């Protein structure tokens, strides 16, 4: 029980400090936002 409590306490730090993952969700958000931004920026092209 003590070991589990210590590890679950360390989780709250290691989730955002060690990074590794949790960049996947932000990557999904960034990809979608960038795709929408590119789509709405393509309206300024004359295309000839």
């Amino acid at each position: 029980a003590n070991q589990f409590n210590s590890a679950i306490g360390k989780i709250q730090d290691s989730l955002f400090s060690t990074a590794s993952a949790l960049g996947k969700l932000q990557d999904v958000v960034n990809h979608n936002a960038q795709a929408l931004n590119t789509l709405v920026k393509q309206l300024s092209s004359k295309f000839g």
Binding site: N37, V40, K41, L43, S44
Partner: protein, 48 residues
């Protein structure tokens, strides 16, 4: 009120509201990060 506006040849449709944007004296209209017109200057009243 949503209207068809013709500001000195610039034709568009939308509602025109009072703006907190502070145009520099040489600036005539404002654009958004994706090159969409966000603001205009009234030729008569010099209003943003």
């Amino acid at each position: 009120k949503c209207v068809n506006f013709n500001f000195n040849g610039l034709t568009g449709t939308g509602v025109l509201t009072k703006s907190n944007k502070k145009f520099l004296p040489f600036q005539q209209f404002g654009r958004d990060i994706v090159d969409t017109t966000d603001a205009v200057r009234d030729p008569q009243t010099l209003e943003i």
